[PDB]
Amino acid sequence: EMVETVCGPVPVEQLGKTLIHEHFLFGYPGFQGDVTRGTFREDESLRVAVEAAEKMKRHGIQTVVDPTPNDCGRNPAFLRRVAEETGLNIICATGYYYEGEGAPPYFQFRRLLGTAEDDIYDMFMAELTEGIADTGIKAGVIKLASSKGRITEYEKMFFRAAARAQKETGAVIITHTQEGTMGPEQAAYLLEHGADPKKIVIGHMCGNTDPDYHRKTLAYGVYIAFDRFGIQGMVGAPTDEERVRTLLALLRDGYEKQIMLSHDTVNVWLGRPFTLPEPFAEMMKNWHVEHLFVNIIPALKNEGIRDEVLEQMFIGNPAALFS
């Protein structure tokens, strides 16, 4: 009945239209070391994040899940300023990123000491049930992430701790899959450890363009997310045209009660600014929070997808996920 947002508990029935995966802030681990040339400018960053929230609201979005990992610059107090300013519900995560682009040395060291997995569970419980740091904000989701072609020994500690914490709390799990791999394996591994499929979203499933891989994942009874619309050419991503093709195949198969959509935007980058060289910059030009509404949903309706199906994905599914 309630879910924890950065402004406290909100009834699940009031979440309304939701984007299941976007970042207001994000940095690659190591951004902290480039603080001199890459300082976090609070005022300007807040203006940018607020403008992003305002754009989302213009398209009827009432709730965003921001699954920024703990080791990637997660800042709940900043998210609260955005929500307090805009009235958008923002739900944040507890979790670490995958080994390949995360910051594994700290918990790798605790693994060597023999405490890491219990420590991770302790962290999850604290952040889900007590609060993050001194912010008073509880996470509403656990974020998990795996590597390309395998769930590493490091990552599996977090998967196990997540299943444990979920059993205790009923918290939703949101995942990252890398380059269209491990969707089935993530679902299997979590359910093998007692997690509830109706509380799991296997993420970045748009990264794979073979609909049998999606069907295999969907057979576990989990949610999947096509959550990187607008990301093309980069991080091994297929095109939006390929995402749409794959998505249409599944909707025409009747899977709409298991699918959610999003962009995985990064609205403010932590660390030093950068510009993408061509041709990448042109390929990435639609990576923004209005793209689903301006471009993708019209293309879906232009291929016969009806409003009730879209509403199932954006409103119905988040309501069920968090219930």
Q: DSSP character for 223? A: E
Q: What is the dihedral of CA 227, 69, 54, 81, to 10 degrees?
A: 170
Distances (CA, A) of 132 to 62, 68, 193: 23, 14, 26
Report 97-116 residues binding a second copy (CB under 8 A): 100-110, 113-115
The residue among 132 and 305 lying less far from a second copy, judged by its C-beta, is 132
Is residue 1 near a second copy by the rule CB under 8 A? Answer: no
- Three-class secondary structure of residue 190 per DSSP: helix
For residues 60 and 84, what is the distance between their CA atoms, to the nearest angstrom? 18
Q: What is the dihedral of CA 25, 29, 32, 37, to 10 degrees?
A: -80
The residue among 184 and 203 lying less far from Co ion, judged by its C-beta, is 203
Please choose which of Co ion, a second copy, none residue 39 contacts, taking the beta carbon within 5 to 8 angstroms, the exact cut-off set by kind.
a second copy
Is residue 34 near a second copy by the rule CB under 8 A? Answer: yes
Determine which residue in the list 8, 11, 30, 60 makes contact with a second copy, applying CB under 8 A.
Answer: 30
Is residue 35 near a second copy by the rule CB under 8 A? Answer: yes
Q: Is 21 annotated as a binding residue?
A: yes
What is the token pair recorded at 34?
Answer: 């480039």
Is residue 264 near Co ion by the rule CB under 5 A? Answer: yes
Stretch that binds Co ion, among 128-136, 234-242, 263-271, 312-320 (CB under 5 A): 263-271
Is residue 152 near a second copy by the rule CB under 8 A? Answer: no
User: Following DSSP, what letter does each residue of 97-132 receive, concatenated?
Assistant: --TTTS-THHHHHHHHHT-HHHHHHHHHHHHHHT-S
Question: Can you give the binding site for Co ion, defined by CB under 5 A?
Answer: 176, 264
Which residues line the annotated binding site for Mn(2+)?
143, 176, 204, 264
Which residues line the annotated binding site for Fe(3+)?
21, 23, 143, 176, 204, 264
Which residues line the annotated binding site?
21, 23, 143, 176, 204, 264
